[PDB]
Amino acid sequence: ENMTPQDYIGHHLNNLQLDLRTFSLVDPQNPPATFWTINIDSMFFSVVLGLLFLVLFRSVAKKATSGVPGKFQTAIELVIGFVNGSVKDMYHGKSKLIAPLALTIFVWVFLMNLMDLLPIDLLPYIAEHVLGLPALRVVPSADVNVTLSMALGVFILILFYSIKMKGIGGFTKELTLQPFNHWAFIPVNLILEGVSLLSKPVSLGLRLFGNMYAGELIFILIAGLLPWWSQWILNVPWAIFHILIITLQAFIFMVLTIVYLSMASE
Amino acid sequence: NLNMDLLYMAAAVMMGLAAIGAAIGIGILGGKFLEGAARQPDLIPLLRTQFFIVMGLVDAIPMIAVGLGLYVMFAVA
Amino acid sequence: NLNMDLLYMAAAVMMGLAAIGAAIGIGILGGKFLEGAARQPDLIPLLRTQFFIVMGLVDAIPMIAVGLGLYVMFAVA
Amino acid sequence: NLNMDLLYMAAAVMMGLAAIGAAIGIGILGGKFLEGAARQPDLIPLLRTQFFIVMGLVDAIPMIAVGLGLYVMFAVA
Amino acid sequence: NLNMDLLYMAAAVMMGLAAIGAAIGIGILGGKFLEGAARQPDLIPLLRTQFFIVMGLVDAIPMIAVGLGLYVMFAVA
Amino acid sequence: NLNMDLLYMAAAVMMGLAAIGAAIGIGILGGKFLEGAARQPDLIPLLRTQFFIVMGLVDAIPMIAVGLGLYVMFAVA
Amino acid sequence: NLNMDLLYMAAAVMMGLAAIGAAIGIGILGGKFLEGAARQPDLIPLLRTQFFIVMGLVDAIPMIAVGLGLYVMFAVA
Amino acid sequence: NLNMDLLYMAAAVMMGLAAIGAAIGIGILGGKFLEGAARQPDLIPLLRTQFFIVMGLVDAIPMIAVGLGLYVMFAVA
Amino acid sequence: NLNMDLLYMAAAVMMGLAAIGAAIGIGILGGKFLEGAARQPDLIPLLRTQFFIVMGLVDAIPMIAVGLGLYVMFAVA
Amino acid sequence: NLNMDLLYMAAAVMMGLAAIGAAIGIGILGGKFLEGAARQPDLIPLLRTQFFIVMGLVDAIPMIAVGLGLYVMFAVA
Amino acid sequence: NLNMDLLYMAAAVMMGLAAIGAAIGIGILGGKFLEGAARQPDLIPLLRTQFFIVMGLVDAIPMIAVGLGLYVMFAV
Amino acid sequence: TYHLDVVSAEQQMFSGLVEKIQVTGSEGELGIYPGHAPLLTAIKPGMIRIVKQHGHEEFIYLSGGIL
Amino acid sequence: MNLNATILGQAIAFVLFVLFAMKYVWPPLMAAIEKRQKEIADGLASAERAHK
Amino acid sequence: MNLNATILGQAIAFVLFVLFAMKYVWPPLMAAIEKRQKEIADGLASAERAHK
């Protein structure tokens, strides 16, 4: 294999895209010019994760005893409460809709992050050495594409609840007379409150994206740059460390979602 | 020549400053959290809930710049 | 070209700075909130309400600097 | 050419430093405000009145610099 | 001639440093002012008098810097 | 070409800033932790465990910038 | 000619640092002064006295700097 | 030539910022350790233990930095 | 020739940093001095005595540097 | 010659920054050692022996940088 | 030539940073000294003894820097 | 030297002139010399060290109190 | 790497899963828990009714 | 680089990382879940004896 790690490390950042116009596979050496080139790997893995989540929960929801729970039902109702209390202590409107959304967020993002624990080459190695495919990366949240999607969804949900609960008139009043309380400065408030508005999804996405992108990149670098035999003493620590990140980056997404919506309505 | 290295320096600036701000703000907040914990060793979970509540807003803006730094380092360079 | 490549340092600085100023300013404010919470743990969600209120004023300059920090890189460059 | 680029850098620096200044100043001020409130919640609104009163003086010199940063880019260009 | 842009940059950084200094100084002062309020609220007028007295001393040099920077940006430049 | 040394310099910048941030934030947090230990010498296990829970967060962005520094040093150059 | 540019830059940085120093220096002192006042009315005139006594020292080197800045920008230049 | 000169500037910024960070962080932690020691002249060795624990964390990034500085100044040199 | 430019610049820097040092050092010291006084004015003159006996030292390197700076700005021109 | 003049600047920063490090990093540390001393004069000997212990760690890395600062400044010239 | 003023800049750098370090480090320390004194106004001598015992330390690296600054500034 | 009173609600346990005392105060062991600035604090149970003028040491056991 | 069309597809999969959880997972399990909470808490009703 | 040897280096770490997960991350999960089954069993048994 004619690979300097000095560029194998680069190939690993490449995306197996489509073009809607061509409906074929965008080769790594030349990228096509269009908005219309799906990251096939992300949509394929993302949903392969989220459907696993939904299935593993529905299979229990179809049976859940009001008696002594199974050792496996136990964990699921455990985390059901772990989410439920976090909803209850912070959101104080009526809307049923918050809690399921937050549960999906927490578990799905947890899995997406969890993607990267596995050795970096293992699935690409399968996708090339056996299954004859050109290229493959297997962490959805190592892409802005998934994260800005989710974040903009939460932005639309802000636009949903902020009107639904305080009407367009109050919505605009906040957006025109906070923070200064004086009509004498409204146009400044109009700028401030709007870019504040968009900070929430922007930061929401980019937080997760950056943390997971870097957690991946360190794995890539460790794989390539080192003599393979010295790599354990520096791949063990980062793996250990990434547990906390994969967990908290999802938990914090959930928490801030709840807080932003609850601040919207209230 | 100018096409390349100046962007790497720009990303270095971006992400160095991001590191300073994130580490220091998070440190201050966590210090107050642990102090309060040592004063009320019962309330660990309530306190650390509120800790995670606000702590996201600390990283909110620095990770803007870290993301845009990865843009410039790989969306351009 | 230089007349375009040099702007990535402009945006790099402009928001790289506003990040740490914001993150630390937020961190401090979040700090005092926690110490209050630890000393009036029954009063938290009152303090948490004022926290968010004042916390908005912190971001005023940092965000518009992120605005201009964004406009430069994509519009000017 | 770059004659009209150093000006973009001069705008960036001025607005970034203004960001740091206003962010930290208001962070400190709001921290002391929150703790004062926590110790005397009966006084929250009076405290908030004095808080805005003082914040006014904080933001003035940072604000003048942001306006000049605007002017440099859009007025003098 | 290369003349004007260097003066623009110089004034930019000058009044940016002015912004930082004045903002943070007044932030510190206002924070101690506020906690002094929450300790003895009925003294608020006297504390306000003394706070304004001292604030007049702090903004002195910063506003001199403002003068020079705005001058060089509008009386030289 | 001289393109190399600017990259090495950018990586120096980035690692220096990252180390500043990491050391200072962790120092603040650890100092508060040691105070708590002095008070509650019997709780040092619970506190020592709680401490890491956030110590992992303070050194997030430092651990981003360290990796990018190494990438620019060895991979790019 | 090119001498003008750097003369203005030198005076600029000089006085920016002067502003930082003097503003922070008096801010800290004034904060402690107002804390004292809130503790202890009926001392206030003596506090103001000794405050001004030390105040006069903080401005010393800053006043040197703000003198020499004008010397550069208008005596020399 | 300068491929063989600016690398010393790179090593310089690396090790200088690493020094500042390590010194400040360990100073803060040691300050709180000495204060705890004064308050608890019996726990001196136990606090010393926890201190040597977290001190190792505070210096982790700085030592990466100085190792890289050595590499640069003697490998690429 | 060009020698004048860097020498005026060096003077500006070498006296600006000394200004910041002396300003903030004396401010920090004076904060404690005023606080000690306000706690018990009976001791004001004893504290003032020991205060000057300290303040002499904070001013050492600042004024040394101001000496070298004035020398430069005038003697070396 | 074009070569060695530049290296004095690199030395200036390593040996300059190291000063700010070992200076403040120790100033903070000693300050607590005094506080501890004022409370418990009868332990003033015991605390000192702890002060010298940790004080070695704080100025370890600065001693690295001044060490190299000589190797660059004088040896490699 | 281009050497001289550059080396005076290099000296000014070290002098400014030494001044920053010395002023801030000694302020941060003398403040605690004065508060200790105001705590126990009868042990001022013992505390002043220790205050110098450590002031001598904080000024080590800063004085090294000022020395090398003078050296460069005049020995070359 | 200064004047020290150790009194209980029931009875008085010490008086006279002293050079120093060392007292395990709530927020950390403490030691008082003459002139000490005004202070107030609880204290924990356990001994207290008195050295009477002319340096004659003696101990006392306290079950608590306020200094 | 860069802005794609993939964002819209992820938004569609996202809302699909949010509904598929909302209806057929969440109430189904919270009903279970709180029904168990009813039958557990109401056991006290004996010591509060027959006892009386 | 021997790419196969680097996939060796992956395996050492990843078998090493699993050996940390089994001894430090899994037992906190199987202990807390057992604590949960404990609480539910107890809160049912006692309440229904109160039903008796």
Side-chain angles (χ1 to χ4, degrees):
Chain A
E1 167 62 328
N2 187 246
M3 274 290 110
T4 53
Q6 318 189 9
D7 183 43
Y8 144 88
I9 293 162
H11 279 275
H12 260 315
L13 305 180
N14 293 343
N15 309 335
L16 191 71
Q17 276 170 227
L18 203 77
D19 177 355
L20 315 206
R21 297 294 271 35
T22 75
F23 246 109
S24 202
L25 290 200
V26 150
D27 81 39
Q29 274 330 246
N30 107 312
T34 187
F35 184 112
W36 308 114
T37 54
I38 314 186
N39 297 29
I40 304 186
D41 289 345
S42 287
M43 296 295 311
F44 259 157
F45 277 68
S46 68
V47 291
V48 158
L49 286 180
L51 211 73
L52 184 138
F53 144 62
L54 283 171
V55 165
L56 270 43
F57 273 59
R58 182 64 180 143
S59 100
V60 168
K62 218 167 187 181
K63 302 185 69 177
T65 81
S66 291
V68 187
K71 203 168 180 177
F72 182 101
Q73 298 188 8
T74 301
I76 276 184
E77 68 166 74
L78 250 178
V79 84
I80 290 283
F82 204 115
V83 174
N84 178 54
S86 311
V87 178
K88 187 164 56 68
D89 47 359
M90 294 191 270
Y91 175 55
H92 304 277
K94 284 195 181 187
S95 188
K96 294 146 59 190
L97 167 60
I98 301 298
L101 172 57
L103 175 61
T104 62
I105 282 165
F106 176 64
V107 186
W108 197 17
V109 180
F110 179 36
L111 286 161
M112 283 185 265
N113 297 349
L114 187 62
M115 288 263 77
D116 196 19
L117 273 287
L118 312 182
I120 181 61
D121 290 313
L122 217 74
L123 303 197
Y125 173 96
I126 289 171
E128 173 165 347
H129 290 240
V130 172
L131 299 177
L133 319 181
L136 169 91
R137 35 193 309 239
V138 306
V139 183
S141 55
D143 295 324
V144 127
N145 301 348
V146 314
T147 55
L148 295 192
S149 185
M150 300 179 86
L152 291 169
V154 188
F155 181 28
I156 290 172
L157 265 73
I158 291 168
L159 297 164
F160 189 40
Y161 277 106
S162 60
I163 308 308
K164 185 173 180 178
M165 296 280 164
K166 54 189 176 196
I168 189 67
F171 178 96
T172 48
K173 167 152 189 175
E174 289 183 11
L175 277 62
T176 48
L177 293 163
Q178 282 179 351
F180 300 151
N181 302 0
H182 301 300
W183 78 112
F185 301 81
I186 294 150
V188 181
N189 308 341
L190 275 165
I191 296 163
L192 298 172
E193 306 305 291
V195 194
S196 170
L197 169 81
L198 272 81
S199 178
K200 304 166 105 86
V202 176
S203 63
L204 269 164
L206 293 173
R207 167 182 303 115
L208 174 62
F209 163 68
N211 288 271
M212 287 294 123
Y213 201 101
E216 162 160 45
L217 172 54
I218 278 287
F219 284 129
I220 317 175
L221 295 161
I222 283 293
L225 299 166
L226 281 157
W228 64 270
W229 67 266
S230 72
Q231 292 190 6
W232 59 269
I233 181 156
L234 298 175
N235 200 27
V236 163
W238 191 243
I240 271 174
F241 193 108
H242 209 55
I243 299 305
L244 182 59
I245 308 304
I246 64 161
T247 38
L248 294 182
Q249 297 290 350
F251 176 61
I252 296 159
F253 204 130
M254 181 200 90
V255 170
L256 261 61
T257 308
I258 294 162
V259 174
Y260 288 166
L261 293 175
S262 181
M263 180 179 303
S265 43
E266 306 178 7
Chain B
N1 55 339
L2 305 177
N3 200 316
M4 295 299 168
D5 42 7
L6 252 183
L7 303 185
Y8 294 78
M9 191 63 75
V13 159
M14 278 285 209
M15 303 205 245
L17 295 193
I20 294 294
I24 293 177
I26 300 294
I28 285 172
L29 190 63
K32 282 293 201 278
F33 166 41
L34 298 193
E35 164 51 15
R39 177 168 288 93
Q40 308 286 27
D42 302 341
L43 302 184
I44 272 47
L46 162 63
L47 288 185
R48 82 192 169 185
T49 299
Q50 303 307 275
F51 166 89
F52 293 127
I53 296 327
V54 292
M55 178 269 301
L57 299 202
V58 178
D59 262 359
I61 179 169
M63 284 180 179
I64 304 289
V66 176
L68 208 58
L70 289 179
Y71 168 99
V72 186
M73 268 257 273
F74 301 94
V76 184
Chain C
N1 204 356
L2 186 58
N3 67 337
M4 297 187 284
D5 301 325
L6 186 49
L7 287 161
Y8 287 90
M9 197 62 63
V13 160
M14 192 199 316
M15 64 174 66
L17 293 171
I20 73 186
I24 292 174
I26 292 294
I28 286 168
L29 175 63
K32 292 300 198 296
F33 157 83
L34 279 197
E35 187 58 33
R39 293 177 66 272
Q40 301 277 53
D42 63 338
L43 207 65
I44 284 170
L46 172 53
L47 296 177
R48 200 204 292 135
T49 299
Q50 296 310 124
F51 163 84
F52 294 126
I53 286 284
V54 313
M55 177 272 296
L57 280 91
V58 175
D59 289 345
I61 307 302
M63 293 301 174
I64 64 182
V66 167
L68 303 180
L70 290 165
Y71 173 83
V72 163
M73 207 180 75
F74 290 120
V76 188
Chain D
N1 286 1
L2 260 65
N3 173 275
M4 303 301 186
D5 180 273
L6 174 56
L7 307 185
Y8 273 131
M9 200 76 218
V13 60
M14 194 183 217
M15 303 178 311
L17 297 191
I20 279 179
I24 296 302
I26 289 193
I28 291 159
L29 181 68
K32 291 294 186 175
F33 162 65
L34 282 193
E35 185 52 20
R39 283 165 69 271
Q40 300 211 350
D42 318 348
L43 222 55
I44 277 170
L46 164 59
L47 293 170
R48 206 198 311 130
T49 300
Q50 295 297 159
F51 164 78
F52 289 119
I53 285 164
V54 173
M55 169 282 298
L57 290 171
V58 179
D59 268 351
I61 173 169
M63 284 277 176
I64 88 194
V66 179
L68 291 161
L70 275 77
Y71 199 86
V72 161
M73 297 198 292
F74 296 172
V76 189
Chain E
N1 287 313
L2 271 53
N3 202 196
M4 186 163 85
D5 49 295
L6 262 291
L7 316 184
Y8 267 86
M9 187 67 191
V13 76
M14 189 204 313
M15 281 189 297
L17 292 163
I20 287 173
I24 298 186
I26 301 305
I28 289 162
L29 191 65
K32 283 307 203 300
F33 162 82
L34 290 187
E35 86 149 72
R39 275 181 151 61
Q40 292 216 93
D42 58 288
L43 306 183
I44 277 164
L46 179 48
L47 288 179
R48 272 194 285 102
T49 299
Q50 295 295 171
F51 165 79
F52 296 130
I53 285 160
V54 171
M55 169 277 290
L57 258 68
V58 173
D59 289 345
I61 303 310
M63 295 310 227
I64 290 168
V66 168
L68 290 198
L70 196 61
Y71 178 108
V72 174
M73 191 162 160
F74 282 80
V76 175
Chain F
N1 282 23
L2 277 67
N3 175 15
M4 162 217 292
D5 42 42
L6 272 163
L7 268 44
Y8 270 79
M9 177 68 173
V13 170
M14 197 154 55
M15 174 147 302
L17 289 166
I20 289 277
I24 287 184
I26 296 176
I28 290 163
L29 182 76
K32 292 300 197 287
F33 154 88
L34 289 191
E35 157 171 358
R39 278 192 166 76
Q40 312 292 0
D42 50 328
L43 292 181
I44 65 184
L46 187 142
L47 287 176
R48 182 281 324 299
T49 309
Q50 273 284 153
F51 157 82
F52 295 134
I53 305 305
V54 302
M55 182 281 303
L57 298 192
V58 74
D59 289 345
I61 302 301
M63 291 292 178
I64 299 191
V66 165
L68 300 197
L70 293 171
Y71 165 76
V72 180
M73 288 187 72
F74 292 86
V76 191
Chain G
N1 66 355
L2 296 171
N3 293 124
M4 303 161 73
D5 312 6
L6 267 162
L7 279 160
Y8 287 104
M9 183 68 68
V13 70
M14 210 168 188
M15 285 184 49
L17 298 168
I20 293 282
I24 296 299
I26 295 310
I28 292 170
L29 194 73
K32 282 305 205 288
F33 165 77
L34 297 191
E35 166 180 325
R39 264 168 163 267
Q40 287 278 68
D42 306 17
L43 302 189
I44 284 170
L46 176 52
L47 299 184
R48 201 189 302 116
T49 301
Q50 286 289 181
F51 162 97
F52 266 86
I53 305 311
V54 161
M55 185 292 296
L57 311 180
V58 167
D59 289 345
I61 312 307
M63 292 282 177
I64 288 173
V66 182
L68 300 189
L70 300 175
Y71 160 83
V72 173
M73 192 144 89
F74 292 104
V76 184
Chain H
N1 288 8
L2 265 62
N3 283 101
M4 307 191 80
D5 295 318
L6 272 283
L7 311 187
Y8 291 83
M9 173 62 58
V13 68
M14 288 201 84
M15 296 181 66
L17 301 189
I20 285 183
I24 295 289
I26 306 168
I28 293 167
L29 186 75
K32 284 300 202 285
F33 162 74
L34 288 189
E35 177 266 11
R39 287 168 194 260
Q40 288 278 24
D42 294 342
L43 306 189
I44 276 174
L46 173 60
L47 297 180
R48 181 193 291 182
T49 295
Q50 307 311 314
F51 164 69
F52 285 136
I53 298 304
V54 308
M55 167 281 299
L57 272 73
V58 147
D59 315 1
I61 312 326
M63 287 185 157
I64 298 302
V66 295
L68 296 209
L70 266 47
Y71 182 102
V72 169
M73 206 174 75
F74 296 106
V76 284
Chain I
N1 66 17
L2 67 93
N3 299 143
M4 293 290 179
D5 312 336
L6 282 303
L7 293 180
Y8 278 109
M9 187 82 255
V13 51
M14 191 159 65
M15 287 185 278
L17 295 198
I20 283 186
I24 291 185
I26 289 183
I28 287 169
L29 184 67
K32 303 302 206 299
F33 165 73
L34 293 198
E35 169 202 26
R39 224 163 56 218
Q40 61 216 328
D42 310 299
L43 305 183
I44 280 158
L46 172 61
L47 299 183
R48 195 203 303 112
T49 302
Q50 287 293 171
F51 165 95
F52 294 133
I53 295 296
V54 172
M55 188 277 294
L57 285 295
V58 167
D59 285 356
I61 313 308
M63 62 209 200
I64 290 160
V66 164
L68 301 181
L70 291 182
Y71 161 72
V72 164
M73 179 158 76
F74 289 97
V76 196
Chain J
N1 306 70
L2 214 76
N3 302 176
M4 318 316 184
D5 34 0
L6 182 276
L7 307 189
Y8 288 85
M9 196 65 64
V13 166
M14 286 187 62
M15 307 184 96
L17 291 174
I20 292 178
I24 294 175
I26 303 301
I28 287 175
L29 174 63
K32 297 306 192 303
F33 166 73
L34 261 55
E35 161 172 348
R39 295 184 82 265
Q40 274 283 350
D42 315 55
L43 296 184
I44 206 161
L46 171 59
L47 293 165
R48 197 197 298 116
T49 69
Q50 299 305 135
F51 165 61
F52 294 142
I53 283 163
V54 301
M55 171 260 180
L57 273 68
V58 173
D59 289 345
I61 303 302
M63 287 297 191
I64 299 302
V66 180
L68 276 86
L70 292 161
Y71 178 84
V72 173
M73 176 158 165
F74 270 88
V76 176
Chain K
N1 65 354
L2 281 159
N3 173 291
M4 312 312 176
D5 57 53
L6 180 70
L7 256 59
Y8 282 102
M9 198 77 159
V13 164
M14 288 184 67
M15 237 70 75
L17 298 185
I20 283 285
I24 299 302
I26 290 174
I28 281 178
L29 177 59
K32 276 297 199 292
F33 171 34
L34 302 195
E35 95 175 37
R39 188 189 184 100
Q40 301 232 52
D42 292 345
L43 297 191
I44 293 179
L46 178 56
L47 297 181
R48 205 199 304 104
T49 299
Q50 286 301 157
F51 165 63
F52 297 142
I53 285 290
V54 57
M55 170 174 81
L57 298 173
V58 283
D59 273 6
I61 308 306
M63 288 321 307
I64 282 175
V66 173
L68 267 56
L70 288 155
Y71 169 89
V72 170
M73 188 183 204
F74 294 118
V76 61
Chain L
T1 48
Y2 56 83
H3 189 277
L4 170 72
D5 305 331
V6 184
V7 295
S8 176
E10 306 192 346
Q11 66 185 350
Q12 169 154 3
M13 303 157 67
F14 184 103
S15 188
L17 259 53
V18 160
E19 316 199 349
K20 66 154 86 82
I21 70 189
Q22 172 180 354
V23 204
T24 178
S26 49
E27 303 316 80
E29 179 121 330
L30 172 64
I32 317 301
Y33 287 73
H36 192 306
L39 176 142
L40 176 63
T41 178
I43 77 190
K44 277 153 293 200
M47 289 287 186
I48 183 175
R49 285 195 56 258
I50 324 298
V51 311
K52 302 190 295 296
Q53 81 179 348
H54 312 306
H56 295 284
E57 170 177 79
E58 70 192 40
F59 283 12
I60 306 178
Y61 179 96
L62 302 189
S63 323
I66 279 176
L67 177 139
Chain M
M1 286 153 23
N2 67 329
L3 217 190
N4 212 284
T6 291
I7 198 165
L8 179 71
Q10 178 61 10
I12 294 307
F14 177 32
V15 82
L16 272 173
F17 286 177
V18 84
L19 302 182
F20 288 1
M22 175 192 318
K23 289 179 80 172
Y24 307 105
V25 162
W26 185 251
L29 299 170
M30 268 294 291
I33 298 165
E34 291 306 329
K35 190 162 56 186
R36 173 161 53 242
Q37 294 309 144
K38 179 177 171 60
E39 66 191 19
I40 286 173
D42 299 8
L44 310 169
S46 313
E48 303 105 48
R49 291 209 45 56
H51 169 286
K52 294 192 185 172
Chain N
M1 71 178 187
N2 179 355
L3 181 140
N4 192 77
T6 74
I7 294 175
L8 206 180
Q10 270 164 95
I12 298 157
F14 190 86
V15 82
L16 262 38
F17 168 66
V18 172
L19 307 170
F20 173 105
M22 302 285 103
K23 100 184 184 193
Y24 297 104
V25 185
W26 187 32
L29 296 174
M30 91 192 299
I33 282 159
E34 287 149 10
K35 171 180 166 191
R36 264 271 152 267
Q37 280 194 306
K38 176 52 169 163
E39 171 167 59
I40 294 165
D42 297 0
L44 284 166
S46 93
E48 299 180 46
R49 287 174 192 146
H51 193 90
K52 116 185 175 181

